[PDB]
Structure 1
């Protein structure tokens, strides 16, 4: 039995994909206990595991839902005219739309500049749940945690960079550090504060 052909895969939302096909096996219809029932298979495109996730439908289009944002997926289709099935169709591919991140960057470290005081080299790692291409890294730092979250010192890092230099930091002073990730579809949540205390003047010698 000829498997369905003309399989399309259209990204709808950051979780939904519309697959559509056509069946050239069209007889004198419509009857009755042998209605052509299609099955839509799908999994993560080109991956390590991916045990598929099928679903039945009698129409010529199914919409996969609950997919992961910013993810390519494999889509194949079969047809079953009881009691005679077909092989799987040619796989179509689609990548779900992006979405605002749902996590904060990890490995947020603050290293003192060498051998310049007053300056540090912040480093970090992109968030696991980016849900898109990171376009900017908004960084915050201040010398008092009692003040609101917004009125710190906001600095916008390039987004393709994981290291930023902050300068003119008072000596013998405790600083706080928070960082969030940003993409095309919005900005993620801030990380948990990470305290760093600058050195004293009489400690730089020597």
Structure 2
């Protein structure tokens, strides 16, 4: 009957990644709801990976509650560039992703440069 499953055609914004204060390997990726969401978001799928040479598919996809606009990652490498790409998904489907943000992870084991 209702075969009108299209989905959002725009990626989220305000995509920021900050290292937790209680844990370095942990980060709080916050974002905002898209405009062309084409319908309230029911779920948010985030993707992150240190290597971009691989297809967004090979990346590590993470499901999030549409109600929430943030995601906490655990077990992250130290002193390694990590790309970020999140998107919006509604009862219908999911659209594109946001630009790959370049955010390096804290460094617990440092050679004592500074």
With the shorter chain as reference, the TM-score category is 0.7 to 0.9
Deviations 1:80-102 (A, max 9, x none): xxxxxxxxxxxxxxxxxx84111
- Residue 183 of structure 1 deviates from its aligned partner by 0.4
- Residue 115 of structure 1 deviates from its aligned partner by 2.9
RMSD, aligned α-carbons: 1.7
Whole-angstrom CA distance in 2 between matches of 1:195 and 1:121: 14
Q: Is the 8 A contact 1:99 1:132 kept in 2?
A: no
Larger radius of gyration: 1
Q: What count of residue pairs does the alignment treat as equivalent?
A: 106
The unaligned stretches of length 5 or more in structure 1 are 1-97
The unaligned stretches of length 5 or more in structure 2 are none
* Length-normalised TM-score, structure 2: 0.87
Q: Is the 8 A contact 1:99 1:184 kept in 2?
A: no
Which residue number corresponds to residue 40 of structure 2?
133
Whole-angstrom CA distance in 2 between matches of 1:99 and 1:141: 25
- Residue 201 of structure 1 deviates from its aligned partner by 2.0
Q: Is the 8 A contact 1:180 1:191 kept in 2?
A: yes
Deviations 1:36-61 (A, max 9, x none): xxxxxxxxxxxxxxxxxxxxxxxxxx
Moved over 3 A (4+): none
Whole-angstrom CA distance in 1 between matches of 2:45 and 2:23: 24
